[PDB]
From Swiss-Prot, chain A:
It comes from Saccharomyces cerevisiae (strain ATCC 204508 / S288c). GO terms for molecular function: RNA polymerase II core promoter sequence-specific DNA binding; TBP-class protein binding; transcription coregulator activity. The lineage of its organism: Eukaryota, Fungi, Dikarya, Ascomycota, Saccharomycotina. It is found in: Cytoplasm; Nucleus. InterPro entries: TFIIA_asu/bsu, TFIIA_b-brl. TFIIA is a component of the transcription machinery of RNA polymerase II and implicated in the regulation of basal transcription. Interacts with TBP (the TATA-binding protein). TFIIA is a heterodimer composed of the large TOA1 and a small TOA2 subunits. Interacts with KAP122. The keyword Nucleus applies. Belongs to the TFIIA subunit 1 family. This is Transcription initiation factor IIA large subunit. It comes from the Eukaryota. It holds the Pfam family TFIIA. The gene is TOA1.
From Swiss-Prot, chain B:
CDD domains: TFIIA_gamma_C, TFIIA_gamma_N. The gene is TOA2. Signal peptide: none annotated. This is Transcription initiation factor IIA subunit 2. TFIIA is a heterodimer composed of the large TOA1 and a small TOA2 subunits. Interacts with TBP. Interacts with TAF11. Interacts with KAP122. Changing residue 37 to D: Decreases ability to interact with Toa1 and TAF11, display mutant growth phenotypes and defects in transcription in vivo. It comes from Saccharomyces cerevisiae (strain ATCC 204508 / S288c).
UniProtKB/Swiss-Prot annotation, chain C:
It comes from the Eukaryota. It is found in: Nucleus. TFIIF is a general transcription initiation factor that binds to RNA polymerase II. Its functions include the recruitment of RNA polymerase II to the promoter bound DNA-TBP-TFIIB complex, decreasing the affinity of RNA polymerase II for non-specific DNA, allowing for the subsequent recruitment of TFIIE and TFIIH, and facilitating RNA polymerase II elongation. The chain holds residues 251 to 350 of 400 of the full protein. Present with 520 molecules/cell in log phase SD medium. This is Transcription initiation factor IIF subunit beta. TFIIF is composed of three different subunits: TFG1/RAP74, TFG2/RAP30 and TAF14. Coiled coil: none annotated. Belongs to the TFIIF beta subunit family.
From Swiss-Prot, chain E:
Transmembrane segments: none annotated. Associates with TFIID-IIA (DA complex) to form TFIID-IIA-IIB (DAB-complex) which is then recognized by polymerase II. It is found in: Nucleus. General factor that plays a major role in the activation of eukaryotic genes transcribed by RNA polymerase II. Sequence repeats lie at residues 54-130. This is Transcription initiation factor IIB. The lineage of its organism: Eukaryota, Fungi, Dikarya, Ascomycota, Saccharomycotina. Belongs to the TFIIB family. The gene is SUA7. The chain holds residues 174 to 326 of 345 of the full protein. Present with 6750 molecules/cell in log phase SD medium.
């Protein structure tokens, strides 16, 4: 559970709708169609994978350290958002 | 610019299923969904770059590692994650690209 | 009048020659061949006359392959106003 | 005459032609400048072969066949212009010092002090 | 490397950081060229001198200079650490011989003048203070 | 005496006899590291034995990091078996050990200055540059590193008998320049 993820999701929905509204008016479809994109999108929004970027990956003998920045992690049906991360893994 | 790996997340797959739902079930114009995907990549990039304050800590046994086309891919078994709570993970996959 | 430094000399004389202290002041411190061929023909579409060094500064890649790609489809003019240029 | 030379002539020569500038061209213009300021004179000294530098007396100067001189330093100032956009005590050489002068050690010595330094009054 | 060789032949002492401060030779290639040059000299067929030089850099009396001489020789005879390059042995020897008297320089000034780490002169000052017993000349 | 040097590293080269492509190899493989902007070769590692092999596009591979000869040969056969498992027609041929590195301890301090003075034609001692001593033995041609604490390093050998003969030929010289 996290309210920051819901706030980020709301900023993403509002910003995407507001920035896409221009391309929706250029195509000439409908504004209520974009409203249906927001309603269906938020309706659909209601396997342990980390997505981010690395800054430095060092290895010493069999010890791996990684510096990660800005990413979302899916762990045990729970989502997380981090600005920094440190990975200290050991290889056989 | 703006990598397309964030599309593989939960919200990314949700937006992909929503766009494919609007294109398949209805008559929503195509190609525009790709523009929604690019705007999605930019918004997730800048949002995760500016609206994040957490700091994780993963410590486990490195099962697999690889690097290709500025892509680091790791597979860790039995790793503990510390948020800023401790979470036990049996298998964790990490995919990262170059930040520069 | 001129001021006479009264110190133990060895300090100033140490600062004269080698004193193991440098810097401290900034002053006067100062590939597939086919794709490369297609890109070269695109640069020819932009302009027919270009120097080989400028092409090496625009394409941004290993230069040996670019030279081999320039010695096949382009002729090198050495004199005239378009000297050292492939056309 | 020698004392007036050491007092005023050094500062006059250093100050009359100290400024030198290098003109650097790039294609944005650039410049550099070096100027000398207040010169500094020492007392008489001797730097030996091993590297030790100590005070010198005229007697030991005559016995060791040395040169009764004193070290000279100059405040060297450096500047870098980029074109009027503006962004050290260096040893210059030794100067032989005349005896019984304001720079030599014997000018302030007394009778018994000259007898200690083995110099006739 | 030729200047350093001419310095080693004339019984003179000049540290690698001094010629390195004069000429930027990138150290490593300097060490290789100095090694093969020494092989050339061998094919064509001493830290004590550093003490008076650094004592001249600090402006110390003669008693501290010869005291750092006896301290340098004795510390060369006691073993333990052996050296870790002779420069640090010289600076910790002068540091002990100057902490024996009353002339104050502290560790920061002598560390910024002689270009030596404070943690290194204190690390050597620890075991040196441990061997303070047999280093007394009078 | 009674001290026997223990091997620490073995560097061998194995020729596969084919050719590779590096994006596909780095894409389909498991434990490997590849980056053309730094080193144009795939760094493949295995767990048993814990070794490291540098694989090039011309088929040449460098297996290094083993503590014994059987671990370098068997590890090389494991790397070649992995290459044959990826999808190339490799062949484990031309296995030649290129380097053998060992170390030992004499359990007494060693006079490096007197050793560099007596054996000046074979030693190269510079404490301000390297606190150890570089002794270049003629027969056998072995490069030895002689430190102060007594740790003796031996490198530059093709067989183990060269290391053993180097230590047996350097032991009396170390016993001569002792301290306690």
């Amino acid at each position: 559970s996290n309210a920051e993820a819901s706030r980020v999701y709301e900023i993403i929905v509002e910003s995407v709708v507001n920035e896409v509204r221009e391309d929706f008016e250029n195509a000439g479809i409908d504004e209520q169609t974009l409203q249906d994109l927001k309603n269906i999108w938020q309706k659909k929004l209601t396997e342990n994978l980390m997505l981010c970027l690395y800054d430095k990956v060092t290895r010493t003998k069999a010890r791996w350290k990684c510096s990660l920045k800005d990413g979302v992690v899916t762990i045990n049906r729970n989502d997380y958002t981090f600005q920094k991360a440190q990975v200290e893994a050991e290889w056989v | 610019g703006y990598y397309e790996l964030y599309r593989r997340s939960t919200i990314g797959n949700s937006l992909v299923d929503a766009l494919d739902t609007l294109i398949s079930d209805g008559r929503i114009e195509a190609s525009l969904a790709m523009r929604v995907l690019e705007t999605f990549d930019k918004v997730v990039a800048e949002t995760l770059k500016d609206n994040t304050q957490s700091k994780l800590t993963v410590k486990g046994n490195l099962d697999t590692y690889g690097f290709c086309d500025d892509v680091w891919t790791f597979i860790v078994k039995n790793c503990q994650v510390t948020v800023e709570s401790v979470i036990s993970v049996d298998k964790l996959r990490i995919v990262a690209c170059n930040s520069k | 009048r001129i001021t006479t430094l009264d110190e133990t000399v060895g300090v100033t004389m140490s600062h004269t020659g080698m004193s193991m202290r440098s810097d401290n002041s900034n002053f006067l411190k100062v590939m597939p061949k086919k794709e490369i061929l297609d890109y070269l023909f695109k640069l020819f579409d932009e302009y027919d006359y270009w120097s080989l060094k400028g092409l090496k500064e625009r394409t941004r890649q290993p230069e040996a392959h670019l030279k081999e790609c320039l010695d096949k489809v382009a002729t090198l003019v050495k004199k005239g106003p378009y000297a050292f240029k492939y056309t | 005459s020698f004392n007036q030379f050491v007092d005023y002539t050094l500062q006059d020569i250093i100050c009359e032609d100290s400024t030198l500038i290098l003109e650097q061209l790039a294609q944005i213009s650039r410049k550099y400048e070096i100027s000398f300021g207040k010169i500094y004179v020492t007392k008489p000294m001797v730097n030996e072969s091993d590297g030790v530098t100590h005070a010198l007396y005229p007697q030991e100067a005559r016995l060791r066949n040395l040169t009764y001189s004193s070290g000279l330093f100059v405040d060297v100032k450096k500047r870098t212009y980029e074109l009027k956009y503006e962004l050290g005590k260096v040893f210059i050489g030794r100067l032989p010092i005349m005896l019984r002068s304001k720079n030599c050690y014997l000018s302030e010595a007394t009778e018994s002090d000259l007898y200690k330094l083995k110099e006739c009054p | 490397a030729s200047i350093l060789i001419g310095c080693r032949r004339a019984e003179v002492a000049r540290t690698f950081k001094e010629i390195q401060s004069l000429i930027h030779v990138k150290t490593k290639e300097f060490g290789k060229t100095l090694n093969i040059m020494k092989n050339i000299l061998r094919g064509k067929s001493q830290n004590l001198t550093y003490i008076p030089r650094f004592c001249s850099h600090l402006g110390l009396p003669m008693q501290v200079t010869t005291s750092a001489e006896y301290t340098a020789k004795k510390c060369k005879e006691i073993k333990e650490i052996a050296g870790k390059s002779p420069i640090t042995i010289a600076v910790v020897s002068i540091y002990l011989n100057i902490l024996l008297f009353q002339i104050p320089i502290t560790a920061a000034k002598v560390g910024q003048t002689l270009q030596v780490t404070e943690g290194t002169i204190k690390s050597g000052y620890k075991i040196l203070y441990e061997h303070r017993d047999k280093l007394v000349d009078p | 005496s009674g001290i026997v040097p223990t091997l620490q590293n073995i560097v061998a080269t194995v020729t596969l006899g084919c050719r590779l492509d590096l994006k596909t190899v780095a894409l389909h493989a498991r434990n490997a590291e590849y980056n053309p902007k730094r080193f144009a070769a795939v760094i493949m590692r295995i767990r048993e034995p814990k070794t490291t092999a540098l694989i090039f596009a011309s088929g040449k591979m460098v297996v290094t990091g083993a503590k014994s000869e059987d671990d370098s040969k068997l590890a090389s056969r494991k790397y070649a078996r992995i290459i044959q498992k990826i999808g190339f027609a490799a062949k484990f041929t031309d296995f030649k050990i290129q380097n053998i590195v060992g170390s030992c301890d004499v359990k007494f301090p060693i006079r490096l200055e007197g050793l560099a003075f007596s054996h000046g034609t074979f030693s190269s001692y510079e404490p301000e540059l390297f606190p150890g001593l570089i002794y270049r033995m003629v027969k056998p041609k072995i490069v030895l590193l002689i430190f102060v604490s007594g740790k003796i390093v031996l490198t530059g050998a093709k067989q183990r008998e060269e290391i053993y003969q180097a230590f047996e030929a350097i032991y009396p010289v170390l016993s001569e320049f002792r301290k306690m």
